[PDB]
Write a protein that binds this ligand. Structure first.
Ligand SMILES: NC(=O)C1=CN([C@@H]2O[C@H](COP(=O)(O)OP(=O)(O)OC[C@H]3O[C@@H](n4cnc5c(N)ncnc54)[C@H](O)[C@@H]3O)[C@@H](O)[C@H]2O)C=CC1
Ligand SMILES: NC(=O)C1=CN([C@@H]2O[C@H](COP(=O)(O)OP(=O)(O)OC[C@H]3O[C@@H](n4cnc5c(N)ncnc54)[C@H](O)[C@@H]3O)[C@@H](O)[C@H]2O)C=CC1
Ligand SMILES: NC(=O)C1=CN([C@@H]2O[C@H](COP(=O)(O)OP(=O)(O)OC[C@H]3O[C@@H](n4cnc5c(N)ncnc54)[C@H](O)[C@@H]3O)[C@@H](O)[C@H]2O)C=CC1
Ligand SMILES: NC(=O)C1=CN([C@@H]2O[C@H](COP(=O)(O)OP(=O)(O)OC[C@H]3O[C@@H](n4cnc5c(N)ncnc54)[C@H](O)[C@@H]3O)[C@@H](O)[C@H]2O)C=CC1
Ligand SMILES: Cc1c(CN(C)C(=O)CCc2cnc3c(c2)CCC(=O)N3)oc2ccccc12
Ligand SMILES: Cc1c(CN(C)C(=O)CCc2cnc3c(c2)CCC(=O)N3)oc2ccccc12
Ligand SMILES: Cc1c(CN(C)C(=O)CCc2cnc3c(c2)CCC(=O)N3)oc2ccccc12
Ligand SMILES: Cc1c(CN(C)C(=O)CCc2cnc3c(c2)CCC(=O)N3)oc2ccccc12
Lengths: 295, 295, 295, 295
């Protein structure tokens, strides 16, 4: 037999806000492979996510092939915009969603993980935001652009920089990107193109640095369109899904567990020679040199 | 549990000549996954390969995790330079090692597979040759350049074209490449650069064509240096292995099974959304923008 | 003033069949810059081209900005499929177009150029053919695929290898490619995708080899769609032209002289630091991540 | 004759602090082509630069081919970190070098140019900085990374956003980048890899956006190493220069005017079909697949 075996491994997944995104899909497949799952959930939705899970609202999505339910060892409120408490502005501190929580900056979450688990094996980054995604880049503000980069790109560096010293041998990371990183996709606004370009560039540089510092592998998955929370909010994700079905080598729609399976493989000992890679899991759409009108 | 399960599937691997190349490594991992293995072996070395196998010469390399030995259901003498018997030059017809054999063109091998097995599930292409690899491309002859393309590139198209109509649902292909395809590597001569460029370009085109025609997936793996038969003949493979260790994000040398494990994943149902991809399994050397002296 | 000054430089342009392709456009712009123009014209259309030129049929297309006419110092019948007369099948020798002519192999043309002009300064490759472009790659024959490679890609190596020894200091080359080389474009069949992938790969390799051997620069231009002879012959070039207008950052249709202007700059002393480059002259269509429908 | 004709065209160059950088080289070549030259100079070094200029310290680097001296029509104090006065932080406002100057935010500078000149034709972005360039990406702070993106990447968007509406027909932009944007170069620290990745991604997106909005073309040049102000502070620029000479297809060192000549071509009417392009002007180093250490 050939197993993707993650038994006893501890994965931290940053960016699970419901059962509809890639983060959930990755969690599910890492669990199928035997991993222990810790979750970073964004502060302003932490209460609702954690409550919905306890109230059984996600149970249809928790079914594992062994009959058991997907279970998280711990869920940490987190805002990966902030490395230390000093970084948090008064506007955030006085926000009612934040004021009733504590220990949610990156350095703080990592210290808690260290206290309770000692080490991690797998770091998964499945988070992105721009406050101005609906704006053309020409019309995107400086603060908006830098916010897109801070949340969507630097957040990875912060997570790896802080978790790195407590990663075990054979540890690796996963982040998620989209092809608009280095090809023009009108509609992907608010500096999100730059944030993904940065994320992909950093994947390569970090593969070398983390590789030489800790022996850690660093890979990114470029996914096709999915009607997640983020996806649905853009306003036309359904048009993108349909377009990809007409465009791609294969017509099947994305499912979060497809990206999850690729992530499981990449963080497993079966991928020890794979690092710095951008792996396309988009039914081959990215290889096309023309749109479906000229087929 | 998460398994890469190929039990009941038939893989045809074109290009196993001994236990020291990537083809053997791929066979071993597909077998670990449960796949039944058919092999195409170059005519002039078919007798020695088959005989050595039966003598137990490769037994140390044959051991599997379950305690079984790697076994081939059938080994076919084959020369992928030829599609039909009408293609074979008189000199080859008169050659000692060809003249007392028959049915070694691509069409003939596929017809024998179809008769005895009906269908295949996985096609692996692990074969390359240029008669002029030591020569700078500037000094490579038309005959040499086209022979490199014929053997190393077109052979994949012939194998997929002939096998495609008998591939089952969920079928996929793997071929092997090297980064000199689209970056200049002095010493990768005799048109091998062009043969690899063509193979990767063909990978994308065939992913669309085979995807739409048969639902077949088509992927390529770009590997790090290995001291195979072909690798040792170039004359400086050990220096290349050493260079990659100094250069890459991770220092581990290539092992055939690392590419085998990648192949096994790519052909499994876990990778249904992956097609047209070039997957680097080279310890990240390919992502570097400068060599080791400037680190 | 800043001039692209090719005064006294001798350019050999392989692939001018009439006034409608990129070869002619390149010739006009090199002529504007002051270059002497030598032409290689495909054997089967050599007489036709020469006779049309003599009857004044292209005179409207010959007007240079200085009031003079685009003038060719010599037009050579050529077939770049053949390096030496020994390579020509008797079947070709007996064809009427070839029987009426002589000295059209690559070696023979270069020998005539050396005899009467001594050296050249610029080599332009503006030729391609596949006998099976209407066929899916899956359905393309070995003979067809290799013929595309021989005519469209090896021909460049042959011309550079033969002309290189008689190139003056500061010499450079230009070839023409299309984005289907490394992205999948259904309809670009007959192995043309592989031929352009090979052409682009060889550009990089030859930049290094010819740069080190003769100080020669080697560049390629990836152009937008044009209704040339070859263009029109695909049967749907007009739809490709219209598609590009809806798709690209800029809407203007290709003109042969746009590519010609890029060629003129790249072969001028102003581009001494540019080599191995693939320069897109396609109104930016190649940078798009989706087609028109999702704008 | 074939002229790169910029007669009467108004060019604004962001990032000239002395005569040793790419900005100066670009100015000189645009001036050779006939352009009027406006310069944006970083506030802290605006006085030293303008005083050095009129003192005649740069007269040796000002000589043009027509026998005239390079002349800046207007030199504007500028800090491209700031879009409007509202953006300026307290420490900067009270700083010795800013506190007496006024109108140095991007919006204010564009307004001055609009009053003075009505419109512009060419925008050159030759600026970059990270306060943490010596630091591994892993050790780079959030403030440092975002500062690198703000100064090196968003600044271009701000300049184009503000300048666009007063750009004439046929207008275009140039920026400068380095290959570390999408390939790992250890030592290009402080988030500069991400800054350049963003710059290049933005080039593609803005080519579409600016192309459709104003008909403006947008291109970037990727240069080899130069001993500039920024280049020398890095601390090993001479080693990089030597490495490139050993590595590249051609051995000549970079000269600022090489990038300048490429820039003049790209902003000229001869390049009307070129947009969104990344043009390498680095003697071909970028196309290499291995380092000099082998060969
Ligand atoms: N959904 C799609 O079509 C595609 C998404 N991707 C990438 O996949 C990743 C995951 O996105 P999805 O699963 O689609 O949506 P998602 O909305 O379910 O997940 C993104 C998460 O980021 C979290 N987040 C936002 N700001 C945060 C902060 N400051 N600190 C901590 N968490 C924050 C959100 O709570 C949200 O849960 C993203 O990187 C996205 O760019 C890639 C390709 C396609
Ligand atoms: N060895 C290395 O460093 C690397 C090899 N690759 C690629 O891996 C693939 C396998 O190569 P290796 O395992 O290294 O060497 P290998 O020598 O073990 O395999 C090449 C096979 O091709 C067969 N072959 C040659 N001409 C044939 C023909 N006309 N008809 C049928 N079979 C023919 C050979 O007999 C041999 O079995 C090749 O495509 C190679 O280009 C890629 C990367 C690195
Ligand atoms: N036309 C278009 O949309 C585009 C064309 N290209 C490339 O531009 C180049 C020139 O093509 P075009 O100007 O468009 O058409 P063209 O038909 O005018 O030029 C092709 C020439 O190749 C010559 N030729 C064919 N076989 C030859 C042989 N065995 N020996 C010597 N010459 C031979 C033909 O006589 C013909 O004149 C080609 O490489 C083409 O692939 C690239 C991009 C776009
Ligand atoms: N120098 C080299 O080896 C290479 C440089 N490049 C790129 O070339 C461009 C120009 O760099 P160089 O000519 O080498 O150095 P440079 O130091 O001469 O020019 C950079 C300019 O940016 C200005 N600047 C810095 N912060 C500014 C701000 N907040 N507002 C306005 N101006 C600011 C500086 O004063 C300086 O004049 C940069 O984008 C650089 O990344 C690219 C490749 C190679
Ligand atoms: C696919 C695809 C996506 C999904 N994708 C890859 C993404 O990365 C989505 C990221 C995202 C970042 N910030 C925000 C939102 C979504 C919506 C809500 C909001 O407040 N901010 O977006 C597109 C935009 C245009 C075209 C395709 C796509
Ligand atoms: C790695 C690497 C390889 C291995 N590799 C990726 C290859 O593709 C090897 C291919 C090959 C093709 N034809 C022949 C031979 C080897 C030797 C025996 C024969 O007669 N002809 O070759 C190099 C050449 C230069 C630099 C690196 C490498
Ligand atoms: C543009 C474009 C082209 C033009 N182009 C870039 C080409 O390279 C055309 C090449 C070509 C090579 N061989 C032949 C023909 C054309 C027609 C006549 C024949 O006998 N053989 O072809 C396409 C096919 C599909 C989509 C776009 C394009
Ligand atoms: C080339 C090359 C460069 C030049 N280059 C392309 C650059 O973009 C240099 C940019 C730069 C950015 N920030 C700062 C400085 C320079 C010096 C002073 C300071 O305060 N910060 O830098 C390298 C670093 C490592 C390896 C190669 C290179």
């Amino acid at each position: 037999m050939l197993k993707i075996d993650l038994t006893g491994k501890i994965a931290f997944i940053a960016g699970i806000g419901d059962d509809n995104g890639y983060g959930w899909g990755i969690a599910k497949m890492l669990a199928e492979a035997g991993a222990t799952i810790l979750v970073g959930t964004w502060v302003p939705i932490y209460k609702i996510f954690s409550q919905s899970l306890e109230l059984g609202k996600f149970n249809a999505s928790r079914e594992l092939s062994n009959g058991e339910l997907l279970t998280f060892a711990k869920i940490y409120p987190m805002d990966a915009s902030f490395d230390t408490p000093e970084d948090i502005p008064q506007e955030i501190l006085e926000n009612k969603r934040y004021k009733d929580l504590s220990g949610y900056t990156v350095s703080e979450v990592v210290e808690q993980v260290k206290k309770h688990f000692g080490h991690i094996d797998i770091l998964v980054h499945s988070l992105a935001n721009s406050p101005e995604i609906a704006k053309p880049l020409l019309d995107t503000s400086r603060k908006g652009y830098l916010a897109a980069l801070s949340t969507s790109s630097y957040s990875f560096i912060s997570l790896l920089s802080h978790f790195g010293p407590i990663m075990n041998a054979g540890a690796s990371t996963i982040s998620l990107t989209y092809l608009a990183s280095m090809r023009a996709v009108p509609g992907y606004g608010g500096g999100m193109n730059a944030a993904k370009a940065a994320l992909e560039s950093d994947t390569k540089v970090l593969a070398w640095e983390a590789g030489r510092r800790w022996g850690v592998r660093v890979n990114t998955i470029s996914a096709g369109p999915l009607a997640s929370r983020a996806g649905k909010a853009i306003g036309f994700i359904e048009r993108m899904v349909d377009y990809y079905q007409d465009w791609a080598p294969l017509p099947s729609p994305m499912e979060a567990e497809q990206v999850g399976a690729a992530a499981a493989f990449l963080v497993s000992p079966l991928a020890s020679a794979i690092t710095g890679e951008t792996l396309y899991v988009d039914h081959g759409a990215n290889v096309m040199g023309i749109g479906p009108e000229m087929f």
